[PDB]
Symmetry: C3
Subunit: 185 residues, 3 copies
C-alpha cells in the first residue's frame, strides 16, 4: 500500500512531478538511512549502472523501491509491469497487450511499447522512442530520442540506438547504432 | 446504439483493449456466422486487402462493422470520421479541424492527422506517424512508424512510406518511399 | 478572469477547438476594433513575424492576448509559461520541470519540452518535435515536424530545423539545418 511520502534519490524534480501526479503528498530528496522511517523509495537516476547499484543497496537497507507511473500512461491489462521494481513510466507512454517491462526500466515521455515486446531490466527508452510488435530489448540498452525499432527484432544487452535512429535488423551482438545528424545549409 | 458485446475478427488483444476502453463488456474472437446473434463487429486485421475482403463479406452477412476509437483520441467536432466503417483509432491519436477519415483506416498510437487532411479508405497510419495540414493520402497506403508527410502533399493510392521516413514532394504515381536505416558503429 | 467569448484573429478552426476545449463558449473570427467589447483575444497566425506585429498592435488597442492551452497538455508546476502572452499549447504537449516558455510561442501537438529548456519568444515547435533537457531555443526559431534537439544544446535566434531532423551540436549562429528526405525506390 503506497505511503503518503516518498524518498526520491532535474530528473529529481521530474520524478517528483510523476510522484505527485500519482498522489504522493510529499517527496523527500536524498543524494545509515536504514534508521529512517520506511516511506516508499524511488531512484531518479538516468544512468543504467548507478540506478542498478543504488537499487541493490537501497533494497538491502529494507526499503520498498516502488514504480512511478504517470496517470496518463496507458497499460494493457495483459501487459506485465514488474511490481515495485523501480520502473519509471512517464506521461503518455502506451504499453500494449502482453508486453513485458522489467525492473529498473525507464519509459520516457510518449514512448510506445507495442504488443508482446520485452523491455529488459535497466534499459532506457527515451522521449518519443517506439518499439514495434514482438521486439526484445536486452538489459541495459538505451534507445535515443525519437528512435524506433521495427517489428520482430532483438537488440542485444548493452546496446545503444542513437537519436532519431531507426533499427531495421536483428542484433544478437552488443553495439552502437546511429541515425543521421541535421546538416547546416 | 453500440451492443454490450463485440465480435472481433496480438492485434486481436489490442483491439480488444480499445473495445473494453469504449465500454464493451465482452469481446468474442472469430478467426454461416449470419446465424449468430448480431453483436457489433470489428475486423482486427492489419493487412489492407484482407481487412477489405472480410469487411465486404461481414457486411454482406448482415453485421454492423463499427469504429473502435480509444477514449483518449481527440477528434475535432468538424472532422469527419465515416460512421460504422471499421475504422480503428488508437490511443492519443489527434485528428484536427475538417480532416476526413475514410472507411477501414487504421490510425495507430500517437499518429496525428492535421487540419483538412483526407485519409483514404483502408490506409494504414503507423505508430507516431504524422500528416501535416491539407495532406491527401490515397486508398490502401501505408505510412511507417515515426514517418511523416509535409503540408499540402498527396500520396497516390497503394503507396508505401518507410519507417522513420519523411515525405517532401507530391506523388501522383504509386510508389515506395524509404528513410535511413540506423548504422552499426 | 477568462471571458466567456474569445476573439480569434485552418489554423483558426484549430485554435477554436483549443478555445472550446478550455471552456470558451463562443469564438469570434477577425481577419477601430478598440470600440468592440473587450473579450479575450488570440492570434491564430502560424507565421512568426505577423504573429508578432499583430500581437503588438492588438495589445496597443487595449485587448488581453490570452494563452490557449489544451486541457491534455501537461505542464510541470515549476515550469514557467508567460501569462497572457499569446502562447498556443496544443493537445498532448508535455513541458517538464523548470522549463520556460516565452511570449508568442507555438507548441504544436505532441511536442515535448524537457526539464530546464527555454523556448524563446515567437518560436514555433511543430507536431511531434522534441527538445531534450536544458535546451535553449532562441527567439523566432522553427523546429520542424518530428524533429528533435539533443540535451544541453542552444539554437540561435531565427534558425530553422527541418522536418525529421535531429540537431546534435550547439549553434550560436543563425542557420538552416536539414534532415533526410524519403527516397522513391
Ligand atoms: O489500463 C487502462 O486504463 C487502458 C489501457 C489501454 C490501452 C493500452 C493499450 C491500448 O489501450 N486503454 N485503457
Ligand atoms: O529522453 C531522454 O532521456 C534522452 C535521450 C537522449 C539522447 C541522446 C542521444 C540520443 O538520444 N537525450 N535525452
Ligand atoms: O472532441 C474532443 O473532445 C476534442 C477534440 C479536441 C481537439 C482536436 C483537435 C484539437 O483539439 N479537443 N477536444
Ligand atoms: O505501427 C505499426 O503498425 C507498424 C509499422 C511498421 C513499419 C514497418 C516498416 C515501417 O514501419 N511496423 N509496425
Ligand atoms: O500540471 C499537471 O496537471 C501535471 C503535470 C505533470 C507533468 C509534467 C511533466 C511531467 O508530469 N503531471 N501532471
Ligand atoms: O506542425 C507544423 O506546424 C508543421 C511543421 C511543418 C514543417 C515543414 C517543414 C518541416 O516541418 N509543417 N507543418
Amino acid at each position: 500500500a503506497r505511503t503518503e511520502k516518498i524518498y526520491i534519490y532535474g530528473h529529481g524534480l521530474v520524478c517528483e512531478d510523476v510522484a505527485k501526479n500519482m498522489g504522493y503528498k510529499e517527496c523527500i530528496f536524498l543524494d545509515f538511512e536504514s534508521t529512517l522511517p520506511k516511506y516508499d523509495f524511488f531512484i531518479a537516476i538516468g544512468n543504467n549502472e548507478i540506478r542498478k547499484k543504488i537499487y541493490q543497496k537501497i533494497s538491502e537497507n529494507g526499503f520498498k523501491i516502488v514504480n512511478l507511473i504517470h496517470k496518463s500512461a496507458l497499460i494493457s491489462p495483459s501487459a506485465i509491469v514488474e511490481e515495485n521494481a523501480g520502473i519509471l513510466i512517464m506521461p503518455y507512454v502506451v504499453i500494449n497487450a502482453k508486453a513485458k517491462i522489467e525492473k529498473g526500466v525507464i519509459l520516457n515521455t510518449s514512448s510506445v511499447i507495442e504488443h508482446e515486446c520485452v523491455i529488459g531490466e535497466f534499459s532506457h527508452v527515451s522521449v518519443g522512442a517506439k518499439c514495434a510488435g514482438n521486439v526484445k530489448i536486452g538489459k541495459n540498452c538505451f534507445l535515443g530520442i525519437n528512435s524506433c525499432v521495427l517489428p520482430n527484432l532483438s537488440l542485444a544487452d548493452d546496446s545503444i540506438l542513437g537519436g532519431g535512429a531507426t533499427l531495421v535488423k536483428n542484433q544478437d551482438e552488443k553495439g552502437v547504432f546511429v541515425g543521421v545528424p541535421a546538416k547546416r545549409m
